[PDB]
From a paper:
The poly(ADP-ribose) polymerases (PARPs) Tankyrase ([name] and [name]) and Tankyrase 2 (TNKS2 and ARTD6) regulate Wnt-β-catenin signaling (Huang et al., 2009). Tankyrase polymerization is mediated by the SAM domain, a small helical fold highly prevalent in eukaryotes (Knight et al., 2011, Qiao and Bowie, 2005).
[name] SAM D1055RT1, equivalent to D902RT2, produced two crystal forms in space group P21, diffracting to 2.5 Å (crystal form 1) and 2.9 Å (crystal form 2), both with six molecules in distinct asymmetric units. For both [name] crystal forms, non-crystallographic and crystallographic symmetry gave rise to left-handed helical filaments established by EH-ML contacts. Unlike for TNKS2, where protomer contacts relied on crystallographic symmetry only and were therefore uniform, the [name] SAM EH-ML contacts varied substantially. We conjecture that the variable relative orientations of SAM domains reflect filament flexibility. However, the equivalent residues (D1059T1, K1066T1, and K1081T1, respectively) mediated binding between a subset of protomers in the [name] SAM crystal structures.
Residue numbers in the entry: 1027 to 1089
Protein backbone atom coordinates (compact mmCIF):
# COMPACT_ATOMS: atom_id res chain seq x y z
CA UNK A 1 0.00 0.00 0.00
CA UNK A 2 2.66 2.64 -0.89
CA UNK A 3 -0.02 4.13 -3.28
CA UNK A 4 -2.60 5.47 -0.70
CA UNK A 5 0.08 5.94 2.03
CA UNK A 6 2.17 8.37 -0.09
CA UNK A 7 -0.97 10.17 -1.26
CA UNK A 8 -2.00 10.34 2.46
CA UNK A 9 1.46 11.67 3.50
CA UNK A 10 1.41 14.24 0.64
CA UNK A 11 -2.09 15.44 1.74
CA UNK A 12 -0.64 16.27 5.24
CA UNK A 13 2.51 17.74 3.63
CA UNK A 14 4.61 14.98 5.30
CA UNK A 15 6.08 13.64 2.01
CA UNK A 16 9.57 13.60 3.71
CA UNK A 17 8.40 10.75 6.01
CA UNK A 18 8.01 8.42 2.95
CA UNK A 19 11.40 6.71 3.48
CA UNK A 20 10.44 5.75 7.10
CA UNK A 21 7.01 4.35 6.02
CA UNK A 22 8.66 2.40 3.12
CA UNK A 23 11.53 1.01 5.26
CA UNK A 24 9.12 0.00 8.09
CA UNK A 25 6.53 -1.32 5.52
CA UNK A 26 3.75 0.79 7.16
CA UNK A 27 0.36 0.59 5.33
CA UNK A 28 -2.74 2.67 6.32
CA UNK A 29 -4.08 -0.49 8.16
CA UNK A 30 -0.85 -0.54 10.23
CA UNK A 31 -0.94 3.26 10.75
CA UNK A 32 -4.58 3.19 11.97
CA UNK A 33 -3.45 1.18 15.05
CA UNK A 34 -0.44 3.45 15.81
CA UNK A 35 -0.42 6.11 18.55
CA UNK A 36 2.35 8.45 19.78
CA UNK A 37 4.49 5.73 21.41
CA UNK A 38 4.40 3.52 18.27
CA UNK A 39 5.29 6.41 15.89
CA UNK A 40 8.15 7.47 18.21
CA UNK A 41 9.42 3.85 17.90
CA UNK A 42 9.70 4.09 14.07
CA UNK A 43 11.55 7.46 14.19
CA UNK A 44 8.79 10.12 14.00
CA UNK A 45 10.37 12.31 16.67
CA UNK A 46 8.39 15.58 16.26
CA UNK A 47 5.15 15.69 18.36
CA UNK A 48 3.52 17.85 15.65
CA UNK A 49 4.23 15.24 12.93
CA UNK A 50 2.80 12.35 15.04
CA UNK A 51 -0.22 14.60 15.91
CA UNK A 52 -0.81 15.43 12.17
CA UNK A 53 -0.65 11.66 11.23
CA UNK A 54 -2.89 10.49 14.15
CA UNK A 55 -5.55 13.18 13.46
CA UNK A 56 -5.01 12.51 9.70
CA UNK A 57 -6.04 8.81 9.99
CA UNK A 58 -9.04 9.80 12.22
CA UNK A 59 -10.40 12.14 9.42
CA UNK A 60 -9.61 9.51 6.76
CA UNK A 61 -11.32 6.52 8.45
CA UNK A 62 -14.04 8.16 10.65
CA UNK A 63 -15.36 11.29 8.80
Amino acid sequence: LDMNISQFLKSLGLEHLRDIFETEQITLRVLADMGHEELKEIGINAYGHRHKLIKGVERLLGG
